[PDB]
Amino acid sequence: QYSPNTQQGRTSIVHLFEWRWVDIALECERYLAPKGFGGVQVSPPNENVAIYNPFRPWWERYQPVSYKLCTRSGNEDEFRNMVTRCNNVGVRIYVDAVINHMCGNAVSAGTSSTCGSYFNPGSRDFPAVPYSGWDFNDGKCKTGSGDIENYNDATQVRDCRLTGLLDLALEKDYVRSKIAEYMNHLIDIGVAGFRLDASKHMWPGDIKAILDKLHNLNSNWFPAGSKPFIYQEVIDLGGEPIKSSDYFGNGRVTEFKYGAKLGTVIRKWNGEKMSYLKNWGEGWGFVPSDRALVFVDNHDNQRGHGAGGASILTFWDARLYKMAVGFMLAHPYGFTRVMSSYRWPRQFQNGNDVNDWVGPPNNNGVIKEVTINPDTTCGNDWVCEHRWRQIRNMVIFRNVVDGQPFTNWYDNGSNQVAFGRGNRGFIVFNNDDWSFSLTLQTGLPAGTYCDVISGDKINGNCTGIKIYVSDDGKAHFSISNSAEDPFIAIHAESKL
Ligand SMILES: CCOC(=O)/C=C/c1ccc(O)c(O)c1
Numbered sequence: 001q002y003s004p005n006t007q008q009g010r011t012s013i014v015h016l017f018e019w020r021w022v023d024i025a026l027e028c029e030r031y032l033a034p035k036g037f038g039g040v041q042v043s044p045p046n047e048n049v050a051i052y053n054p055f056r057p058w059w060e061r062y063q064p065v066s067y068k069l070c071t072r073s074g075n076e077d078e079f080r081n082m083v084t085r086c087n088n089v090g091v092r093i094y095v096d097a098v099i100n101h102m103c104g105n106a107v108s109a110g111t112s113s114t115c116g117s118y119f120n121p122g123s124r125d126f127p128a129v130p131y132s133g134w135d136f137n138d139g140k141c142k143t144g145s146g147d148i149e150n151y152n153d154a155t156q157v158r159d160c161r162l163t164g165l166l167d168l169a170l171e172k173d174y175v176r177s178k179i180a181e182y183m184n185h186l187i188d189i190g191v192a193g194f195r196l197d198a199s200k201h202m203w204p205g206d207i208k209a210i211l212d213k214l215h216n217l218n219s220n221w222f223p224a225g226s227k228p229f230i231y232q233e234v235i236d237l238g239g240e241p242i243k244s245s246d247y248f249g250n251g252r253v254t255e256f257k258y259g260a261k262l263g264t265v266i267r268k269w270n271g272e273k274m275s276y277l278k279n280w281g282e283g284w285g286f287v288p289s290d291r292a293l294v295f296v297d298n299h300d301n302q303r304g305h306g307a308g309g310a311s312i313l314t315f316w317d318a319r320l321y322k323m324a325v326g327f328m329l330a331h332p333y334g335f336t337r338v339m340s341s342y343r344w345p346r347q348f349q350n351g352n353d354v355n356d357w358v359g360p361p362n363n364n365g366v367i368k369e370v371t372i373n374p375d376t377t378c379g380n381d382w383v384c385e386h387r388w389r390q391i392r393n394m395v396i397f398r399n400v401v402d403g404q405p406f407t408n409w410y411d412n413g414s415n416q417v418a419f420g421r422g423n424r425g426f427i428v429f430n431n432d433d434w435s436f437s438l439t440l441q442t443g444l445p446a447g448t449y450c451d452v453i454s455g456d457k458i459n460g461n462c463t464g465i466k467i468y469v470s471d472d473g474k475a476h477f478s479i480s481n482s483a484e485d486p487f488i489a490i491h492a493e494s495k496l
């Protein structure tokens with residue numbers, strides 16, 4: 001459950017948030033496989049509630065009505081077509097598995113379902129699964145409301161309703177088996193693994209009993225004996241009784257302190273500075289690298305439903321976002337996930353921002369198509385961060401330096417830092433308020449290399465900055481603090 005099951009040399013996954021299955025299939029063929037992306041995390045593919053408004057909020061997909069594969073991203077035929085085409089070009093599919101709960105215990109304030117299945121939250125009746133009142137934790141939870149009242153309390157966190165969502169009794173083997181039936185149907189179609197939603201709200205032993213029922217991967221594409229990659233969503237910020245180490249036996253765990261701290265460091269909060277990232281990873285008290293799923297959108301779609309660290313980013317903030325993603329993709333700690341988002345307005349109040357009824361671009365309920373502009377960016381309100389040159393080229397950097405050690409760290413005691421990845425990559429960052437201009441030791445061999453942040457290596461030549469490495473691996477780097485991207489990255493495949 002710890003190995004990503006990606007093709008050798010492909011080292012990251014991209015979350016194509018709410019994209020349609022057809023658009024992900026095309027993206028796998030025209031962009032993700034040619035650019036070496038390891039896989040895609042898709043939004044929940046199972047049937048969910050549809051509020052009566054239109055209003056198609058993003059959170060509707062986290063309220064299951066059944067396990068039929070029928071959502072605004074597409075139906076089962078479209079889902080199987082996407083998994084087949086993506087696996088055929090070596091791009092894996094990871095499903096967001098919503099298994100802790102069904103929909104809101106109320107929600108009947110006005111609602112329907114995405115594939116027409118009947119459901120009634122009040123009587124706990126979900127006949128398309130089938131689940132009844134005997135399959136929920138209403139009698140195990142001991143709070144007066146039935147909802148979680150203290151989110152650091154270990155028993156309420158796992159047995160009571162998360163924000164009113166009907167909580168499944170995962171100690172029953174019937175419930176564990178229905179969930180495994182759904183997840184096994186997905187593995188058999190060709191899925192390579194899963195994001196386990198709300199894992200903090202499930203007991204480690206119940207998750208393991210579900211995982212022990214999971215199938216080996218489809219051996220028409222994966223070697224025999226391969227097991228599904230599992231990454232558990234658990235926000236563990238520090239002193240609470242629930243800890244990420246309660247879940248290492250089941251698979252990887254999301255390290256939310258990674259994106260939170262990389263965000264406060266790049267923003268210099270409280271005097272923090274990038275030179276403190278010298279011992280980034282386990283030196284910062286994070287989970288072990290072989291159990292970490294890392295990302296920098298600490299909390300994307302930062303609406304009111306969220307109890308943790310958070311930082312969403314715009315223009316001067318897109319600059320900080322690209323710097324954070326580049327540091328993450330060059331650093332060897334953890335398995336990396338990049339987020340691809342959609343555009344949505346903000347309100348500018350409550351302290352930071354509050355336009356929160358966000359939902360993806362939609363064609364009257366169904367997700368809109370992803371369009372590609374002539375410069376390879378996207379239209380139709382999709383942001384496509386994974387197509388930004390600086391991010392895409394850092395996804396490639398991570399592949400090129402796969403397995404090489406962290407080495408050659410440099411820092412100026414403030415926010416100008418640099419490090420190498422063995423003899424195959426080197427990266428330099430300037431987040432101070434003055435320019436950087438110095439000769440540093442790399443582990444790279446002599447030659448001319450293209451900076452992949454400011455340009456590309458096209459046809460034996462570079463489109464942006466060129467870096468010259470001398471015979472003893474030293475190289476001069478000059479970075480203005482006024483550059484749009486104050487960092488430079490070079491690697492073995494961007495050498496001329
Ligand atoms: C121009 C893009 O067309 C497609 O991507 C075809 C997707 C597709 C999905 C499900 C099917 O059963 C199918 O025949 C085709």
Ligand SMILES: CCOC(=O)/C=C/c1ccc(O)c(O)c1
Pocket residue numbers: 236237238243244245282285286287288
């Ligand atoms: C080298 C071993 O390090 C660990 O096992 C870290 C465990 C750990 C558990 C929970 C956390 O929230 C965390 O940051 C770290």
Ligand SMILES: CCOC(=O)/C=C/c1ccc(O)c(O)c1
Pocket residue numbers: 022023369370371372373
């Ligand atoms: C000139 C740009 O053309 C496009 O962006 C086509 C997007 C597209 C084409 C076919 C599809 O089935 C789809 O989902 C999306």
Ligand SMILES: *[C@@H]1O[C@H](CO)[C@@H](O)[C@H](O)[C@H]1NC(C)=O
Pocket residue numbers: 448460461462466496
């Ligand atoms: C590409 O251009 C750089 C200068 O920008 C030069 O050093 C390099 O030799 C050129 N490539 C070839 C193959 O001549």
Ligand SMILES: [Ca+2]
Pocket residue numbers: 100157158159160167168201202
């Ligand atoms: Ca629970």
Ligand SMILES: [Cl-]
Pocket residue numbers: 195233254
């Ligand atoms: Cl997550």
